[PDB]
Structures are given as structure tokens and as C-alpha cells.
Amino acid sequence: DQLTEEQIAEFKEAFSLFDKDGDGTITTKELGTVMRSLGQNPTEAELQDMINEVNGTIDFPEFLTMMARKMKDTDSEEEIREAFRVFDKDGNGYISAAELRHVMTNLGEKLTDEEVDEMIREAVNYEEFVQMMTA
């Protein structure tokens, strides 16, 4: 979905190195070992729930979908938090309301001036604005 090329490549490399020759069918213990080798450390109940969500053989598309559920979102949130501290001179996380209004008006697609002003008045930290936009 919203993954990166390097992440999918590493996942496929790990799946090909752990699984034997033949089809992509793996067992429950094999899936747990692949998850532990990939970097994730899920509990027993969480692993059982993820297995039930997808013979008991986990194929490549289901595994890629399970890996793309939250990793891409976390990476995007980290990238947004890193890029939000660019307009600030010192990057302390707090900026004036006029600067944020100008940034929202002159950037971020085409937005109406009245709507941008109303959104700025309804809303100091960038994380607070991100959480308000996510809500």
C-alpha cells in the first residue's frame, strides 16, 4: 500500500531466506520466527489473532498486508514530525500564529483564505495541530 521499496525488498528477502524451496506456504511457528526475525515481537495472543485474521498456510500477499498495516503509517508520522520543524528558526516546536497561517495559506494545496483563517482561529505545538487534524 503506502510502504517503501526498501521495506518490501527486505521483507521479501527475509521471507525467501527463511522459507525453504517451493511454494510460499509457512506454518504458525514459521510465521512467528519470521516475525521475530523481521523486527517485530508480538505476543502469543496477538500472533494467534493475526493468524486467525489470515491448512494454516500464510501466503505472501497476506504477510505483506499484515506488515503494511502500521509500519507505513508510523514511518509517515515520523516523516511528518521531522518535516514540520522546518519553518521554525530554531525548531523548538512552537511558532507564532501568523507564521502558521501564512504557511497554511501559501502551502498545502489550494485552500481558501477564510477557511484557513477559521482553522487557525479554531486551533501551539505542531504535534497538537497534527492530532487535531487527525481527529
Author numbering: 3 to 56, 61 to 129, 137 to 148
From the publication, what sentences describe this entry?
Ryanodine receptors (RyR) are >2-MDa membrane proteins that allow for the release of Ca2+ from the ER and SR, thus mediating a range of Ca2+-dependent processes. Each forms homotetrameric assemblies of ~5000 residue long subunits. Mutations in RyR1, the skeletal muscle isoform, can cause malignant hyperthermia (MH), central core disease (CCD), and other myopathies. Here, a collection of cryoEM structures provides insights into the molecular consequences of MHrelated RyR mutation R615C, and how apoCaM opens RyR1.
In order to understand how apoCaM engages with WT and mutant pRyR1, we solved cryo-EM structures of CaM compIexes at nominally Ca2+-free conditions, obtained by adding excess EGTA. For WT pRyR1, this resulted in two main classes that could both be refined and with structures built. The main class, corresponding to 70% of the particles, represents closed channels, whereas 27% of the particles contributed to an open channel class. Starting with the structure of the closed complex, the N-lobe is the best resolved, and mostly makes contacts with α helices in the N-terminal part of the Bsol region, encoded by residues 2190–2242 (=interface 1). In addition, the N-lobe is close to a short loop (~2595–2600) connecting two helices further downstream in the Bsol region (=interface 2). Additional interactions include two helices in the Jsol region (=interface 4), including a peptide (residues 1975–1999) previously identified as CaMBD1. Comparing structures of WT pRyR1 with and without apoCaM, both in the closed state, it is clear that apoCaM introduces conformational changes: using interface 1 as a reference point, the Jsol region including interface 4 is moving closer to interact with the C-lobe. Despite these changes, which propagate into the whole cytosolic shell, there is no discernable effect on the channel pore. Correspondingly, in the cryo-EM condition, the WT pRyR1 + apoCaM dataset shows mostly closed channels, whereas the mutant shows mostly open channels.
